Amino acid sequence: TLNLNAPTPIFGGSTGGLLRKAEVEEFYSITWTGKSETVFELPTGGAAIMRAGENLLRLARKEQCIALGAQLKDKFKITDYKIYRVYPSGEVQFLHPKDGVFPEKVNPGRVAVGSNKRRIGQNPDPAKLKFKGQETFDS
Amino acid sequence: DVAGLIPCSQSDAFERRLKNTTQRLENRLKKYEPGSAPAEALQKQIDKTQQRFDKYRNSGLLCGADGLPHLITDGRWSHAGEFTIPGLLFLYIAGFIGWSGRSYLQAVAASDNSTEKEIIIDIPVALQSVSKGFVWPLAALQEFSSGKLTARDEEITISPR
Amino acid sequence: PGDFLVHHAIALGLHTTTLILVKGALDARGSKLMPDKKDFGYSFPCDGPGRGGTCDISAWDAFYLAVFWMLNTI
Amino acid sequence: MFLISWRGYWQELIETLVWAHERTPLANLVRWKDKPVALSIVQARLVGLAHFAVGYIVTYAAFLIASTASKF
Amino acid sequence: ALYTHHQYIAGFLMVGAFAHGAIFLVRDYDAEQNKNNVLARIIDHKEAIISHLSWVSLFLGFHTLGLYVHNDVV
Amino acid sequence: KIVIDKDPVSTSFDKWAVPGHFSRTLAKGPKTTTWIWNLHADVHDFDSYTSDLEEVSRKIFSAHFGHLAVVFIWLSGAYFHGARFSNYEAWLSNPTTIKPSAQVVWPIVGQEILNGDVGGGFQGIQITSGLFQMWRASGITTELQLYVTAIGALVMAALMLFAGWFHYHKAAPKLEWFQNAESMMNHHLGGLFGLGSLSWAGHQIHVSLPVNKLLDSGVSPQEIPLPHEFILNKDLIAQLYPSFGQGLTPFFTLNWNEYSDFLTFKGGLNPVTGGLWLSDSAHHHLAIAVLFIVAGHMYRTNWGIGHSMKEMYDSHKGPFTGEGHKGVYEIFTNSWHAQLSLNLALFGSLSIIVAHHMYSMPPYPYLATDYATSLCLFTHHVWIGGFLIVGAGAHAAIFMVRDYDPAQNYNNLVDRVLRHRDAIISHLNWVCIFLGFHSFGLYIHNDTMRALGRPQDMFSDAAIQLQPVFAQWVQGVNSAAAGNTAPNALANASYAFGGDIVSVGGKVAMMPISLGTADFLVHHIHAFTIHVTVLILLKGVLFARNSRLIPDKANLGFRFPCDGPGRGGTCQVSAWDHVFLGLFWMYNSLSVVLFHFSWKMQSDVWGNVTADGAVSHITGNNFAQGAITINGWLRDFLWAQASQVIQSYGSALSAYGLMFLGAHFIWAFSLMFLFSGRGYWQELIESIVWAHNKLKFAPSIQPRALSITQGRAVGVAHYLLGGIATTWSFFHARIISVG
Amino acid sequence: MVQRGSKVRILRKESYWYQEIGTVASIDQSGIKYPVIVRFEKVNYSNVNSNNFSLDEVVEVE
């Protein structure tokens, strides 16, 4: 659940962020709780301020909501962040952490999508799938 | 008389260089003092062109219609000093540079840590390694017949196919 | 004498131009820097900054360098 | 230009041009149907080499013909 | 004009010949139907051929360029 | 306060056997061959390994002393070769005909034609560095004085190198001493810059001014008295400009107008020598002395008074700037890279001003009419000047990745520049393209209307005129200032704005450089290529931390080759590649500035003047109707004026013709690296290290390809070396022949 | 059977170290596939020295 509107950090700036794509297709958002009043470099320019919060910030893409968390957790020791991807104009809320736990850690119940049960020289040759719709690297 | 060149001891072509070398420098020497320090740099200079030309008149060089000694490598023994004898002088020194690092990189790679020993050039190994490189026209002949010069093609790393 | 040197330059050019094309072709299916090259086809950008760097690793890129040599030879 | 300067430089520059377009009145009104992006890595090699090759010929063709047509 | 035109084309064709050849090696060459024939026996020792081809380019270039520069200074 | 650590590191030759002892990963040994290139890049990259802000500074304070030494070694090399291997003593007898010659060649395998008939009784290479006119200005008459300077420099060369040992290996200062910028500006303005020109005023009045006023009369180099004799003898000096009989007593009753004879405001060219009146430069450096000394009592120290810079930046903030310069003082005490970038920009930009102010106000006697030298100090300092600005763009970007802190810099000016960085770049992007169309496209218009035979349609003086009215009003008001707004000046600031011509010998020292339609057309090309070189360099600094494309470019470092072929491709996203890219554009920016300068002088300004009174210039006023098209730029400048560099064979210029081919070679070699990539040249090692494994002698350090950045860096380093040394050889073997 | 401390050759043809000598480090004596940890004298492109191989992928040059 997004809780829009959650109070954005007090910013005022940035020509570089959330332009006309966000008002036709698929903008993003990230939620976390700031445990001080510390300052951080945005992916747009640098500062916002972390509130007590309820701290939400409509970023541009997926890569900026992932690279913010790898900057948040190292500098400010906060591993509570909860990214999104929006309602009507977007696709799936709560894109990370998809399991509730961080998917760099291992967890029971996940699916092994995109596993090839071989080695890569053990892939078939593209001389062998001539005019055949089977993908060379696919099981 | 192999590619249409006179042996240029008789040529009017090689000799029409000598006058306009020595007339260019005498006209560079005319306005000097005869007891100056550049003057011996312009009297000995024409002598440096004089020892050169009287080394070329005697060696049997084939000079064309230009006056330039051209070289003939089909190698006959009549023109063997042009390329062939500086060829054998090249190859004997080239294997000395060839076998020295070849005998070094066999002698440091057969040690503990040769990755350092490419940085440090070990005189306990390098003077030991040119001692193997001095018998290089004899050592490699008994290294190929004993097979320890090359290796079989499953020792050498093969890129995939 | 002039014709001698140039004739060896063209030979130098003909040998170097075929070299680039043959190395590209004979290593097209794979090399140590990219063992599975054949799985990506004739033309792909590269393989990222990993393994030291792989820019201009495709056979297409190999042909591309040899083109420069072709203009030079002719 | 295409052979020495590579994609990243241009793609980041293009983004500032996209930004500028979207924020300038009397231009905002119109929109591209295809989003602008920098040429690909392989494309640039091809476009650069093609320019390099056409220039090579047209320089030599212009020179060869003109040089002989005055002196023969 | 007649010599240059046809000579530049010839250089393009030959480089192009190796280009479509490299596409064959990545998309059509099957090693599982090419075992010990003239083709597959060559690319067996693929690293040998390229290494020798590399030398000839190096050999030709170093000396021919060397003579021109030698001539140039004198 | 001066606080010191005493001998933190002693004198050991033991660490000399371990290369990479400064670092961590390289004090273990090489496993590939790139470890050599991994080493030799980040040697003098001092914060790459060191974390200690105090210890990283002590290395820099030491290494500057060593760089102070190597100039002094190089200075003595000029001063030593000026005595033994020069025709300097002969050149003071006759400054007009004999060319300045040093670097005599040894009599060996054919380079002894480079010791050509230069003049005097001498044989050597004609040099163009202007040390002869810098020693004639300094007052040097005998050749002994050039010798004792060299040892006098060599002892200072040794004293500087010992001082770098003394201040790191013996007495290392601390960071609270380093951070005292206000006391540092007080001394560097006071001691270095105040007493710099005062001491040179102390030289030039008592030493240079007598013996250079005599050589304008030109009695003899031998019959001029020695420079110490003008302090001993009170009567000998006061023969000329006789105020020394009054002594220091007008200077000490504030009746300073009694020195209206040597400390003056003449302000022209000395018409016998073509240089600036050394009386004026004595009054110049005296006014520079008092201006810089009172500039140095400004900042705060341990005596209460002064301006403190942390107080000045705060309360310099306005409504369009938020916090203003809050924290910007805290940057320049906490980051060497932020200091080096600003120190570099105004150091290169300073030297381009030196190149401009030296050909239009020639400071030296017989440097103006010697066209071999008056060109070559323009184009050298311009060339140095562009390389430092690219270095200013580099370390500005290095500040952004590694030293910039958004914690301290909230809502201040680095914050508000980064928070509008698209509006900067995209308006800069527009004015780049606007300038390229309306400057370079005015040549392509001018190319076609001459090709189509329509000279009524081109942009010329006898055509659609593009008149530089602002540069003609500025050239007007500066040429009509001696007497209206600068009354005490006799003639103007220069003869480049307006006025009569001046001749020395039979050659023109200076004449008014005129600006017409062809000069408007080239000055906007300069404005175009400078704005692009800004645009490459500015984008590298601003997007150094992040962009829209990559949000963590700050994590990947300053110098990383790409982020891979993702997002369509991210090849050259790093700030280092922007500095790599701007290097060719600075090569393009400056080489057209030189092509503007070296052609405008030969056709319009330099030349031989009749004894009737008119001037026939060298390339013959072709810059008006020839310089407006590229074909005129190609024929009448590049093709025509290179006729002497490729016909240099068999003469004493024949080393230049080899380099003019030799730099054409290296420039071609650089194309191999820029046009290629790594993953081709790596797999050619795999077939070749197969062959070196084949004969059982393979190196344990296994070879790899060069890194992509090193492939990029060697591609630009050979490009510039191939491109500038072509221009170095072209400019030499042109102006030595026709000047 | 291959034990620790043995010199091998490489039949993994998709590798950099293919048909080169490796001095192994350990065998994982449980059922996890590719257990032969083979250290090498030479380092690869991405700076690793050791790799998991199969027991069907290592030889006994000894």
Added chain:
Amino acid sequence: AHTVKIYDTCIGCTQCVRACPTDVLEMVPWDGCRANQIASAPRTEDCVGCKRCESACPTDFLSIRVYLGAETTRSMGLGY
């Protein structure tokens, strides 16, 4: 979108998962020993093809491989 395949040579080191800038990969429980883990690509529609992942696999020849495929707005990283 790009195709991301994970081969059976994975040693469950987790380096790859922590390298992806758009969180395309995750570690999942392996059944061949029920103690180690293998990487998986459940969100290949977000793979930009940066190849940061392959630069993190320690094994001599990749356990995770990125084969560039159909390009899309998401994969091109467009904020516009």
